[PDB]
Amino acid sequence: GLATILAISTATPPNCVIQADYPDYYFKITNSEHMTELKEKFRRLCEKSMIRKRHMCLTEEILKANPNMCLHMGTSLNARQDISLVEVPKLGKEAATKAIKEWGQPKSKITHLIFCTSAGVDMPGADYQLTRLLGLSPEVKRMMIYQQGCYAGATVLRLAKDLTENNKGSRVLIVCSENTVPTFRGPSDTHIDSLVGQALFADGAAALIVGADPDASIERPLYHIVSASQTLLPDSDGAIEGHIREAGLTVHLKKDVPAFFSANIEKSLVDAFTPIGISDWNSIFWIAHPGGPAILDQVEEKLGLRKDKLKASRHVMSEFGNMSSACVLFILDEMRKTCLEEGKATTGEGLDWGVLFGFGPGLTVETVVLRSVPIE
Amino acid sequence: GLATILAISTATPPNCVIQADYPDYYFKITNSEHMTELKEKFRRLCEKSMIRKRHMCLTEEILKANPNMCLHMGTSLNARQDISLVEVPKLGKEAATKAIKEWGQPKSKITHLIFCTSAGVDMPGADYQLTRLLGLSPEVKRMMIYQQGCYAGATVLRLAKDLTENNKGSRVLIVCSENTVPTFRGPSDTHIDSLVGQALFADGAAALIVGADPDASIERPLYHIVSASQTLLPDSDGAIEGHIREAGLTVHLKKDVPAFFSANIEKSLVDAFTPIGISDWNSIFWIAHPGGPAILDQVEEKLGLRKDKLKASRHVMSEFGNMSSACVLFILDEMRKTCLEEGKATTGEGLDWGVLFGFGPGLTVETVVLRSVPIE
Numbered sequence: 001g002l003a004t005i006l007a008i009s010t011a012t013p014p015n016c017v018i019q020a021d022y023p024d025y026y027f028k029i030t031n032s033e034h035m036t037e038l039k040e041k042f043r044r045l046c047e048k049s050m051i052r053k054r055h056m057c058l059t060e061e062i063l064k065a066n067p068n069m070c071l072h073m074g075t076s077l078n079a080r081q082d083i084s085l086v087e088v089p090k091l092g093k094e095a096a097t098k099a100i101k102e103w104g105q106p107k108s109k110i111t112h113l114i115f116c117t118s119a120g121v122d123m124p125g126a127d128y129q130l131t132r133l134l135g136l137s138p139e140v141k142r143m144m145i146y147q148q149g150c151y152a153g154a155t156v157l158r159l160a161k162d163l164t165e166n167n168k169g170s171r172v173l174i175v176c177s178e179n180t181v182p183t184f185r186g187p188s189d190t191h192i193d194s195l196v197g198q199a200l201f202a203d204g205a206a207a208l209i210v211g212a213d214p215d216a217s218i219e220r221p222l223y224h225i226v227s228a229s230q231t232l233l234p235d236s237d238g239a240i241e242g243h244i245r246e247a248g249l250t251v252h253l254k255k256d257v258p259a260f261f262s263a264n265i266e267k268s269l270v271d272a273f274t275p276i277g278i279s280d281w282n283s284i285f286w287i288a289h290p291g292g293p294a295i296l297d298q299v300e301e302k303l304g305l306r307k308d309k310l311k312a313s314r315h316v317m318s319e320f321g322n323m324s325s326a327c328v329l330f331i332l333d334e335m336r337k338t339c340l341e342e343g344k345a346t347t348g349e350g351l352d353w354g355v356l357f358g359f360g361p362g363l364t365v366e367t368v369v370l371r372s373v374p375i376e
Numbered sequence: 377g378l379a380t381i382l383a384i385s386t387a388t389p390p391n392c393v394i395q396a397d398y399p400d401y402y403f404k405i406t407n408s409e410h411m412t413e414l415k416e417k418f419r420r421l422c423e424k425s426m427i428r429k430r431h432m433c434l435t436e437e438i439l440k441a442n443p444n445m446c447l448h449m450g451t452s453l454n455a456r457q458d459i460s461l462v463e464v465p466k467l468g469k470e471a472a473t474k475a476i477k478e479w480g481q482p483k484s485k486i487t488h489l490i491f492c493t494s495a496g497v498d499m500p501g502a503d504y505q506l507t508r509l510l511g512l513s514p515e516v517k518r519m520m521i522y523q524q525g526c527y528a529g530a531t532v533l534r535l536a537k538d539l540t541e542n543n544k545g546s547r548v549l550i551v552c553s554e555n556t557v558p559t560f561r562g563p564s565d566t567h568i569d570s571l572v573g574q575a576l577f578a579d580g581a582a583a584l585i586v587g588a589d590p591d592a593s594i595e596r597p598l599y600h601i602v603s604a605s606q607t608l609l610p611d612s613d614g615a616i617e618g619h620i621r622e623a624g625l626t627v628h629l630k631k632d633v634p635a636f637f638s639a640n641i642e643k644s645l646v647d648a649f650t651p652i653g654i655s656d657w658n659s660i661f662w663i664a665h666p667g668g669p670a671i672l673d674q675v676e677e678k679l680g681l682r683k684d685k686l687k688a689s690r691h692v693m694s695e696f697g698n699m700s701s702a703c704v705l706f707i708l709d710e711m712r713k714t715c716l717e718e719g720k721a722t723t724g725e726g727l728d729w730g731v732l733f734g735f736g737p738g739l740t741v742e743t744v745v746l747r748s749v750p751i752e
């Protein structure tokens with residue numbers, strides 16, 4: 001009996017942010033409307049982001065109160081920490097509440113808790129904050145995944161698979177919770193790649209229950225975590241870097257990070273699926289972290305995916321933005337849900353085998369082979 | 377076949393710091409020698425710390441260059457980050473190098489890597505830095521445990537047990553690496569409990585190889601990780617807290633944290649050892665995080681331990697200080713080693729069953745049941 005995903009649920013801050021209105025509002029509130037060339041640069045980024053809206057607990061009101069989070073390098077870590085460390089477990093609890101409610105079991109049957117965030121660290125961490133908030137057993141075995149960035153959505157299923165398979169009867173609550181409080185800053189023309197960050201990053205929390213050997217009479221499998229791998233890309237050092245600094249979380253990118261992922265992604269597909277005997281990347285279903293459209297576009301190209309292998313992935317991208325570790329989890333709610341409503345054979349867009357990708361610092365590719373479960 | 381510890385090794389910065397000379401040097405270099413009452417307070421703390429020496433990569437030379445790390449709340453996170461993020465994986469590599477060398481297998485047989493530190497976070501983290509430094513397979517499955525404080529020495533064996541038992545043929549490199557770069561500050565009489573921090577915290581790196589089903593002909597078991605539990609202490613909220621701030625890692629303690637651990641520790645001993653049928657806490661061997669002497673003293677009292685159940689633990693305490701997640705690991709090297717040299721029946725001070733405790737924020741108690749292996 002494999003680690004089986006029994007329930008999923010998501011939560012986002014109330015404040016919707018329309019990407020069409022963002023380049024004006026951003027350069028208004030960062031008092032930069034005279035970098036007209038940079039403003040148009042950022043307008044192009046936002047239009048090609050393929051993100052309709054984003055959710056952000058960070059509002060205009062909070063930003064007016066903290067001017068230094070509106071500068072590019074404003075001394076602002078404390079102010080961000082003060083917001084973010086409350087907001088991370090809070091918005092994680094909203095999602096967790098609903099995921100338990102869907103799972104249909106008392107919270108005292110949750111033996112393990114995996115919490116994951118890059119929006120700020122603390123001692124004790126958001127694992128403790130969330131355990132106190134939900135009222136879980138004081139004996140829950142917790143794993144606190146801090147600052148692992150955008151591949152960490154698959155990390156948390158790679159973690160949970162081992163936790164749950166080596167501990168008969170166990171049930172893991174996973175909570176990913178992410179926000180832009182530590183990364184929001186004003187623009188700088190010595191630092192264009194931070195504009196890339198400002199066009200993509202959103203807030204979002206996702207929660208799962210994972211357990212092996214599900215009880216057929218009281219819980220409903222959605223996916224089976226078959227395998228999970230992790231690899232570093234050759235010659236990719238420095239491509240993504242993020243430092244926690246007196247100015248918050250500074251994020252420094254390279255232009256050809258979309259090229260590193262596309263070039264190398266088949267290596268991971270071959271490593272994972274060839275021993276299974278699967279070689280046609282269109283014959284599987286697809287979850288891929290929408291880090292940027294350029295990542296997903298180029299993997300679609302290099303591999304020859306039909307125009308809609310990545311529908312669910314790009315859909316969550318446009319409706320929510322880059323919510324770091326949560327995206328891959330949101331995408332599985334969308335596709336699990338949408339299949340049922342459109343009545344496809346399996347939660348895997350009718351297909352049997354699936355792949356789930358996380359991309360982030362290293363550069364790192366997390367490769368999770370899934371199995372769908374039938375519908376109706 | 378249980379998760380078996382195959383090899384251990386330790387490393388420390390060159391700069392030895394004699395606790396007898398520390399209260400003068402500390403108040404000299406923090407330019408505070410006129411808080412004569414506070415200086416004597418700190419002199420009492422240091423004398424009762426039962427710490428002979430500590431190792432610190434942070435030297436007088438580095439401290440003279442960074443005056444703001446000598447103030448109590450000096451804006452200093454960047455300067456500390458700049459030191460610490462190099463030093464963490466570096467000193468972890470020294471230890472890891474030797475642990476592989478003792479294990480007697482090529483580094484390409486290391487399938488997993490668990491890295492653990494509270495001395496500073498980064499993106500990518502010290503898992504990546506250390507993987508690049510040692511030259512491990514790019515496919516090593518990494519778990520990056522950030523900012524889990526002083527119980528994290530047992531966290532990393534609780535993690536490794538599941539990793540290695542659910543992945544036939546696997547071999548886990550654990551590296552804990554800790555230092556006082558982010559926590560060193562000058563004294564403050566509104567903040568006495570930070571003086572407690574200054575009397576105890578040391579630098580130290582520890583590395584292990586953990587694997588289930590060892591090959592009898594080429595690796596030598598030292599311990600078996602039987603079980604691992606984690607619990608929060610009732611009414612203990614706020615007792616230990618640490619925030620990563622513009623001034624570095626601020627650490628705020630409560631006076632009765634030694635009382636929380638002693639009062640509750642038997643709960644965990646009963647939970648772990650009663651199903652095994654073991655009820656005499658003197659009949660087992662003992663590793664306990666020497667967070668402060670008051671912790672170990674009071675657990676010795678509340679439970680009735682003979683005067684030398686805690687010898688190895690207090691020994692590493694006096695010779696090295698509070699090195700956070702590493703201490704519990706150093707203690708297992710000491711006791712494993714010393715038994716052999718004094719020729720006792722088993723690596724467990726001649727005993728069969730053992731306990732290993734981690735203590736830190738939450739408040740959190742990590743309880744790991746070990747098994748010794750025979751000697752000669």
Ligand SMILES: CNc1ccccc1C(=O)SCCNC(=O)CCNC(=O)[C@H](O)C(C)(C)COP(=O)(O)OP(=O)(O)OC[C@H]1O[C@@H](n2cnc3c(N)ncnc32)[C@H](O)[C@@H]1OP(=O)(O)O
Nearest residue numbers: 048049193242251253254255257291292293294295322324
């Ligand atoms: C630490 N991380 C995190 C932490 C927490 C949460 C999340 C994360 C992360 O998210 S992890 C990060 C993973 N995602 C990515 O790295 C994004 C990959 N890129 C794309 O997805 C698309 O490319 C865009 C950006 C939508 C542009 O759209 P598009 O127009 O199609 O691209 P173009 O190259 O044609 O031109 C676009 C114009 O912007 C310029 N420029 C674009 N890129 C970069 C870049 N790197 N560095 C420096 N400059 C750049 C470029 O020079 C050009 O100006 P010009 O020089 O041309 O004037």
Ligand SMILES: CNc1ccccc1C(=O)SCCNC(=O)CCNC(=O)[C@H](O)C(C)(C)COP(=O)(O)OP(=O)(O)OC[C@H]1O[C@@H](n2cnc3c(N)ncnc32)[C@H](O)[C@@H]1OP(=O)(O)O
Nearest residue numbers: 424425569618627629630631633667668669670671698700
């Ligand atoms: C985030 N964490 C980390 C992160 C990275 C790495 C490591 C960590 C950690 O390490 S996690 C932390 C786990 N360890 C502990 O919490 C230590 C437990 N305590 C002891 O081990 C012993 O007690 C001492 C301290 C040696 C004193 O020795 P001792 O003399 O025997 O104790 P006393 O109470 O008799 O008097 C001692 C004099 O200092 C005063 N005072 C002592 N304590 C405290 C305290 N809390 N808070 C406020 N004031 C205190 C006290 O009022 C008295 O002054 P007076 O008021 O009397 O003048």
